[PDB]
Design a protein around this ligand. Structure first.
Ligand SMILES: [Cl-]
Ligand code: NA
Length: 208
């Protein structure tokens, strides 16, 4: 049983209200290399009208960048998609009172997933965050990424992310057994959050 579902990358009020009927959390992307990027003012509006937790999602690297974006948007939740220092992560929680989900890339430095898993756990232990997101990759290495993530998921209630779709999320869940899943383009139709795709995704998460 997955307890947490996040649909990331809402760009409009229409996409937000749709996602809110299904997801435990959503996210709005700023100051990042992303098709879902919106200006800070646009993110500030979605953050104000959201009725579920909405993450300010970004690859911003430095404290002043994050601090400016938190001041301008009023974000309560942030998703740090970068290797900003745990000390800088902690400064944001104390000085702005935000909850943090930290995203980690799944390393592919060994053919044995257990060794990539050991390296990943030592990086994760360096942070004090509400939530751990594991961002899985593509191609043939994806099966390796699931094997790594499955080891991590025994130690932390991780959120599994990366290329999830209605067609493949069932295998990802019973392979990795995460506490949560995160999906973006897998529930888009021509780049718009799509109700029928979301319902197909949720059916798998709730069924088995
Ligand atoms: Cl936190
Ligand atoms: Na705007």
């Amino acid at each position: 049983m997955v307890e947490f579902v996040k649909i990331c990358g809402v760009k409009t009020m229409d996409e937000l209200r749709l996602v809110e009927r299904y997801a435990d959390a959503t996210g709005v992307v700023v100051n990042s290399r992303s098709k879902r990027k919106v200006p800070l003012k646009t993110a500030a509006e979605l953050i104000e009208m959201a009725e579920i937790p909405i993450y300010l999602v970004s690859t911003m690297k430095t404290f002043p960048e994050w601090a400016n974006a938190v001041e301008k948007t009023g974000a309560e939740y942030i998703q740090v998609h970068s290797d900003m220092h745990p000390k800088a992560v902690n400064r944001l929680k104390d000085e702005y009172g935000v909850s943090v989900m930290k995203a980690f890339m799944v390393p592919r430095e060994s053919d044995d997933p257990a060794e990539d898993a050991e390296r990943l756990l030592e990086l994760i232990g360096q942070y004090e965050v509400d939530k751990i997101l594991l961002d899985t990759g593509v191609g043939s290495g994806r099966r390796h990424d699931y094997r790594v993530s499955a080891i991590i998921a025994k130690e932390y209630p991780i959120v599994l992310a990366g290329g999830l779709t209605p067609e493949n999320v069932g295998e990802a869940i019973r392979w990795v057994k995460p506490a949560g899943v995160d999906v973006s383009s897998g529930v888009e139709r021509n780049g718009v959050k799509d109700r029928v795709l979301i319902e197909a995704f949720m059916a798998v998460v709730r069924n088995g």
